[PDB]
Structure formats: C-alpha cells, structure tokens
C-alpha cells in the first residue's frame, strides 16, 4: 500500500523547472556558446554555395 | 535545495530574461530569413 | 507561486548575477576570436578579398 | 548570494567596462567594414 508516481507535466506551464536542474550560472554560457557553434556551421553550408554568399568577385 | 541549487524565485526570475531574450532573438532571427528569401529565394 | 518581470537593456547587468566573469569572461572573449577567425577564413579564402592575393 | 556570487555592485561595475569596451570594439568593428567595402565592396 505504497508508491510514488510523478505528476504528468504539461508544458510549457512547468518550463521554468529546468533551472532547478540546470544551473544557469554554469550552463548559460555553454548554451549560448553552442548556439554559436550551430550558427557558424549553418552559415558555412549556405556560405559555400556562392549563390547565397555576398562576395562573388 | 534542488539539483541546480537555485530557488524557485531564481529559476523563475532567470527564466524570464531567458525567454525574453530568446524571443527577440528568435524574432530577429525570423526576420533575416525574410530578407534572405527576398535577397536569395530558396526551396 | 512566485512570478516576475524583466526590462532590458536596463536589466542587462543582472547577467553577471548569473554568469561569473572571473570564470567566463575570457572563455567568451575567446569564442569571439573563434568566431572572428571563422569569418576571416571564409573570406580570406575568397582569393579576391585578401591583401596578399598572390 | 546570487547564482554567480557577484554583488549588485560587481554586477554593475563590470557591466560598465564591458559596455565600454564592447562599444569601442563594435565601433572599431563598425569602422572596418566601411574600409573593406571601399577596398572591395560586395553586395
Ligand atoms: C548565406 C547566409 C546569409 C545570411 C543569413 C542569415 C540568416 C537567415 C540568419 C543569419 C543570422 C546571423 N548571421 Mg547572417 N547571413 C549571411 C552572412 C553573414 C555574415 C558574413 C560575414 O557574410 C555574418 C558575419 C553573419 C552573421 C550573422 C549573425 C549576426 C547571426 C547569427 C548570430 C548567432 O550567432 O546566434 C547564435 C545564438 C546565440 C544566443 C549567441 C549569442 C548572440 C547574441 C549575443 C544574443 C543576444 C542578443 C539580444 C537578444 C539582442 C541584442 C541586439 C540589439 C537589441 C540590436 N551573416 C548571408 C547574407 N544570417 C541569424 C540570426 O540570428 O539573425 C538574427 C539568422 O537567422
Ligand atoms: C576580407 C578580409 C579583409 C579583412 C577584413 C576585416 C573585417 C571586416 C574585420 C576585420 C577585423 C580584424 N582583422 Mg582583418 N581583414 C583582412 C586581413 C587581415 C589579416 C591578414 C593576415 O591579411 C589579419 C592579421 C587581420 C586581422 C584582424 C583582427 C585584428 C580583427 C579581428 C579582431 C578580433 O579578434 O575580434 C575578436 C573579438 C574580441 C572581443 C577578442 C578580444 C579583442 C581585443 C582584446 C579587444 C579590446 C580592445 C579595445 C576595444 C580597443 C583597444 C585597442 C586599441 C585602442 C587600438 N585581418 C582583409 C584585408 N578584418 C575585425 C575588426 O574590426 O575587429 C575590431 C573586422 O570587423
Ligand atoms: C538560404 C538561407 C538558409 C538558412 C540559413 C540560416 C543561417 C545562416 C542561420 C539560420 C538560423 C536558423 N535557421 Mg535557417 N536557413 C534556411 C532554412 C531553414 C530551414 C528549412 C525550412 O529548411 C529551417 C528549419 C531553418 C531553421 C533555423 C533555426 C534553427 C535557426 C534560428 C534560431 C531558433 O529560434 O532556433 C531553434 C529554436 C528552437 C529549437 C526552439 C527550442 C525551444 C526550446 C525549448 C528552447 C530552450 C532550449 C534549452 C534551454 C537549451 C536546450 C539545449 C541546447 C539546445 C544545447 N532554416 C535557408 C535554406 N538559418 C540561424 C542559426 O543558426 O541559429 C542558431 C543562422 O545563423
Ligand atoms: C527544452 C528544455 C525545457 C524547456 C525550456 C524552455 C525554455 C528555457 C524556453 C522554452 C520555450 C518554449 N517552450 Mg519549452 N522546454 C521544455 C519542453 C517543452 C515542451 C514539451 C512538451 O516537451 C513544449 C511543447 C515546449 C514549448 C515551448 C514553446 C512554448 C517555447 C518556444 C518558442 C517556439 O517554439 O517557437 C516556434 C516557432 C516560431 C516560428 C516562432 C518565431 C518567433 C516567436 C518565438 N517546451 C523542457 C522541459 N522552453 C521558450 C519560450 O518561453 O519562448 C517564449 C524558452 O525560452
Ligand atoms: C544577452 C545577455 C544579456 C544582455 C547583456 C548585454 C551586454 C553584456 C551588452 C548588452 C548590450 C546591449 N543590449 Mg543587452 N542583454 C540581454 C538582452 C537584451 C535585449 C532583450 C530583449 O533580451 C535587448 C533588446 C538588449 C539590447 C541591447 C542593446 C541596447 C546593446 C547592444 C548594442 C547593439 O546590438 O547595438 C546595435 C547593433 C548594431 C549592429 C549597430 C552597428 C554598430 C555601431 C556601433 N539586450 C540579456 C539580458 N547587453 C551592450 C551594450 O550595452 O553596449 C553599450 C553590451 O555590451
Ligand atoms: C567583405 C567583408 C565581409 C565581412 C567581414 C567580416 C570580418 C572579417 C569580421 C566581421 C565581423 C563581424 N561581422 Mg562582417 N562581413 C561582411 C558582412 C556582414 C554581414 C552581412 C550579412 O553581410 C553581417 C550581418 C555582418 C556582421 C558582423 C558582426 C557579427 C561582426 C562585427 C561586430 C560585432 O561582433 O558586433 C557584435 C554584436 C552583436 C552580436 C549583437 C548583440 C550584442 C550582445 C547583446 C552583447 C552581449 C553578449 C553576451 C554577453 C555574450 C554572448 C556570449 C557568446 C555568444 C558566447 N558582417 C562581409 C561579407 N565581418 C568581425 C567579427 O568577427 O567580430 C567578432 C570580423 O572579424
Ligand atoms: C535576477 C536573476 C537571478 C537573474 C537574471 C536572469 C538573466 C539575466 C538571465 C539571462 C538570460 C539569457 C541571456 C538568456 C538567453 C537566451 C537565448 C539567447 C536563447 C537562445 C536560444 C537558442 C536556441 C534554443 C536555439 C537552438 C537551435 C537549434 C536546436 C538548431 C539546430 C539546427 C540544426 C542542427 C541545423 C543544421 C543544418 C545544417 C548544418 C545544414
Ligand atoms: C571593478 C571591477 C570589479 C571590475 C572591472 C570590470 C572589467 C575590467 C571588465 C572588462 C570588460 C571587458 C574587457 C569587456 C569586453 C567586451 C568585449 C570586447 C565584447 C565583445 C563582444 C563581441 C560580441 C558580443 C560579438 C558577438 C558576435 C557574434 C555572436 C557573431 C556571430 C556570427 C556568426 C555565427 C556568423 C558566421 C559567419 C560565417 C561562418 C561566414
Ligand atoms: C524561425 C526560424 C526561421 C524558419 C525558416 C523557414 C523558411 C521560411 C521562410 C520565411 C521565414 N518566415 C516564415 C519566418 O518568415
Ligand atoms: C543577417 C541576414 C542578412 C540578410 C541579407 C540581406 C541582403 C540585402 C542586400 C540586397 C542588395 N541588392 C538587392 C541590391 O542586391
Ligand atoms: C556590426 C558592424 C558591422 C555591420 C555589417 C553590416 C554590413 C552591411 C553593409 C555595411 C556598409 N558599411 C557599413 C560597410 O558601409
């Protein structure tokens, strides 16, 4: 006669509860740094088909 | 105390600036796809 | 329970209430190099836009 | 404490030099593009 089941969470109501798990003081910048790593990569792939590169001679 | 160690009030106060920053970012971002599509359509 | 609000660029400085500069300033000054080098490469490789250009 | 452990003043005094250095950087940064455009325009 005992169990512990967790509340089915409906997002984004409970969205903030992340920072109870992820300490932004440690991870905000790792995050921001990786959105950069992403942005840089996507940039390369479209920067390389010169049709979308702004230089072209 | 939680895993991250923040309060409810820190997580909530933080999350505000996050999603506020996020949106204007994702709005700024949404804008450039417009321009590019004008400038160089794709698909 | 508690809710809240922001308003930057006023509240901008509350950043360093989250991100400690003594730990993270140089790491992000560094990733601008990393960015600024990544940009240069993609244009220095465009042989028209560099000073040496053969 | 704060999440970062700084104080209201350190959070504020620092942000000032950051803005200050940022600006004169993104002003220098603004400057260069002018010249590159003259040395070799693009769009
Ligand atoms: C072939 C591709 C197209 C083009 C299509 C696009 C498209 C499409 C997009 C971009 C976007 C960006 N492009 Mg572009 N881009 C081109 C060529 C360039 C060239 C170049 C040398 O030729 C450069 C330097 C850039 C640079 C950039 C960045 C400014 C930006 C990605 C930012 C980032 O890192 O988010 C990484 C995420 C982070 C969180 C890192 C931190 C970034 C900042 C600090 C976040 C907070 C700012 C706060 C919300 C706002 C403050 C600003 C003031 C209010 C004004 N592009 C050509 C013309 N580019 C993206 C963008 O964001 O547009 C807005 C985007 O959607
Ligand atoms: C198409 C290629 C063009 C050209 C177009 C551009 C453009 C466009 C830009 C540059 C910029 C830069 N280029 Mg160039 N560049 C060319 C060829 C070169 C060559 C070469 C071997 O041929 C070299 C060595 C460089 C080198 C440089 C860097 C000095 C600089 C990037 C700074 C940085 O790291 O920010 C990374 C950011 C950081 C924050 C890291 C820390 C940097 C320092 C410590 C900041 C604080 C200093 C304070 C603000 C001011 C103090 C200094 C004094 C007051 C002067 N270029 C050719 C001719 N180059 C950029 C610039 O203006 O930078 C300012 C820029 O916008
Ligand atoms: C011709 C021009 C190119 C092009 C050039 C570029 C360039 C260049 C750039 C973009 C950028 C973006 N492009 Mg585009 N792009 C094109 C076509 C597309 C297509 C498509 C229809 O095929 C898609 C899906 C996209 C999509 C996107 C986005 C992923 C991104 C903007 C940020 C954002 O709100 O991110 C995703 C938002 C979410 C996933 C929502 C997430 C909700 C979560 C809960 C937020 C919290 C996350 C949590 C805190 C942290 C999680 C963990 C971390 C993820 C590790 N583009 C065309 C073909 N695009 C920019 C970029 O790279 O941004 C980073 C950029 O610089
Ligand atoms: C992933 C890590 C965390 C969490 C952390 C965060 C954080 C942190 C944020 C969000 C935000 C978002 N979250 Mg959440 N989120 C979680 C899981 C979820 C789940 C789910 C059932 O799993 C859902 C449905 C959502 C839904 C969403 C959206 C309400 C929102 C992103 C905007 C967008 O997508 O524009 C989609 C497409 C467009 C074209 C929009 C263009 C511009 C506007 C925005 N999240 C988990 C628990 N979520 C963001 C938010 O609140 O934004 C206001 C935000 O900053
Ligand atoms: C992303 C992390 C932090 C934060 C920390 C910082 C820091 C740190 C700095 C700023 C700076 C600025 N921030 Mg802030 N900022 C945040 C969120 C925001 C939001 C938002 C709705 O979320 C907005 C609108 C702003 C707005 C702004 C601008 C007023 C300013 C950047 C100059 C610029 O891009 O000029 C216009 C853009 C151009 C390309 C113009 C061309 C060049 C000329 C010169 N920030 C969050 C809270 N912000 C900077 C500042 O104060 O400079 C004085 C700065 O150093
Ligand atoms: C032929 C000449 C080339 C060219 C050559 C170069 C070269 C070479 C360089 C640049 C650089 C830059 N170029 Mg250019 N560039 C070209 C065309 C463009 C185009 C375009 C689509 O046509 C765009 C949008 C840009 C934009 C940019 C900027 C990203 C950047 C200069 C200032 C800066 O960093 O402000 C930054 C301001 C913001 C991103 C706005 C937000 C400010 C925030 C709010 C401040 C707080 C940040 C927070 C604390 C921490 C963020 C954490 C980190 C993400 C981890 N260029 C053409 C095609 N350019 C220089 C560079 O790399 O600078 C680093 C550089 O070295
Ligand atoms: C009061 C207290 C305590 C405190 C205060 C608070 C604060 C200040 C806070 C702060 C905050 C902030 C800054 C935040 C920020 C935010 C942001 C900006 C965010 C952003 C985000 C972004 C994202 C999420 C994105 C993502 C993306 C993705 C996932 C994408 C991907 C893509 C792909 C993969 C594609 C690729 C392709 C090819 C390569 C081709
Ligand atoms: C008193 C006490 C306590 C203290 C004192 C304080 C101090 C000393 C402070 C200091 C500070 C400083 C130094 C600061 C600095 C700043 C700076 C310089 C900054 C800079 C910044 C920059 C930025 C933000 C930028 C960014 C950019 C970006 C994000 C971009 C990106 C781009 C892309 C992605 C594109 C790509 C392209 C291709 C690949 C082609
Ligand atoms: C929100 C991130 C951008 C998504 C790009 C998808 C291609 C759509 C082209 C027009 C862009 N948009 C519909 C947002 O105006
Ligand atoms: C950051 C996103 C940049 C979007 C690119 C917009 C370039 C518009 C310049 C076009 C000039 N023209 C129409 C004369 O070719
Ligand atoms: C952040 C400062 C660099 C912004 C680059 C924007 C490029 C668009 C054309 C700029 C023309 N110039 C400013 C080169 O005359």
Domain count, chain A: 1
Q: Tally the C-alpha atoms within 13 A of residue D40's C-alpha that lie toward its C-beta.
A: 15
Show binding-site residues of B for a bacteriochlorophyll.
15, 33
What sign has the CA pseudo-torsion C14, C19, C22, C25? negative
Which structural technique was applied?
Answer: X-ray
- Among protein residues, the one with the nearest Cα to ligand 5's atom 17 is B21
**Host domain of residue D5:** 1-43
In a domain, residue C14? The reply is no
CA distance D35 to chain B (A): 24
d(CA A30, CA A22): 11
Looking up tokens 């990393």 gives C34
Tell which residue, D29, A38, C33, D39, has the closest CA to residue A46: A38
In a domain, residue A3? The reply is no
Q: Supply B17's token pair.
A: 């600036």
Ligand 2 shell residues, CB under 6 Å: C 29, 32-33, 36, 43-44, 49-51; D 21, 24-25, 28-29, 32-33, 36
CB-based contact D2:D11 (threshold 8 Å): yes
Beta carbons within 10 angstroms of residue A56's beta carbon:
11
In a domain, residue A30? The reply is yes
Query: Is B3 touching A (CB cutoff 8 A)?
Result: yes
Query: Is C39 touching D (CB cutoff 8 A)?
Result: no
Tell which residue, C52, C25, B14, has the closest CA to residue A29: C25
CB-based contact C37:A44 (threshold 8 Å): no
In a domain, residue A46? The reply is yes
In a domain, residue C11? The reply is no
In a domain, residue A40? The reply is yes
Annotated resolution, angstroms: 3.7
In order of A16, B19, C20, D29, D33, the CA distances from A21 in angstroms are 10, 17, 19, 38, 43
CB pairs under 8 A between A and D: 9
Q: Supply D23's token pair.
A: 């600006």
A12: cis peptide before it, omega within 30°?
A: yes
Q: Of ligand 2's atoms, which has the minimum distance to the CA of residue C37?
A: 34
Length of chain B: 43
**3-class SS letters over chain A:** CCCCCCCCCCCCCCHHHHHHCCCHHHHHHHHHHHHHHHHHHHHHHHHCCHHHCCCCC
Query: Is A51 touching D (CB cutoff 8 A)?
Result: no
d(CA A40, CA D11): 30
Q: Please name the member of C13, C18, C49 whose beta carbon is closest to the beta carbon of D3.
A: C18
In a domain, residue C23? The reply is yes
Q: What do you get for the CA distance between the two ends of chain B, in Å?
A: 50
C-alpha of residue C34 to centroid of ligand 2, in Å: 12
Ligand 10 shell residues, CB under 6 Å: B 32, 35-36, 39; D 43
User: Which residues make Cβ contacts (< 8 Å) with residue A28, sequence separation at least 6?
Assistant: C18, C19
**Host domain of residue A43:** 21-51
In a domain, residue C25? The reply is yes
Q: Supply D34's token pair.
A: 């002018």
Domain count, chain B: 1
CB-based contact A20:B11 (threshold 8 Å): yes
């Amino acid at each position: 006669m005992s169990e512990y089941r967790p509340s089915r969470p409906s997002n984004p109501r409970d969205d903030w509860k992340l920072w109870l798990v992820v300490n932004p003081g440690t991870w905000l910048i790792p995050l921001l740094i990786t959105f950069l790593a992403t942005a840089l990569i996507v940039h390369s792939f479209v920067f390389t088909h010169e049709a979308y590169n702004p230089l072209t001679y | 105390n939680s895993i991250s160690g923040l309060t409810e009030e820190q997580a909530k106060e933080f999350h505000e600036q996050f999603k506020v920053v996020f949106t204007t970012f994702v709005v700024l971002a949404a804008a450039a796809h417009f321009l590019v599509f004008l400038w160089r359509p794709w698909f």
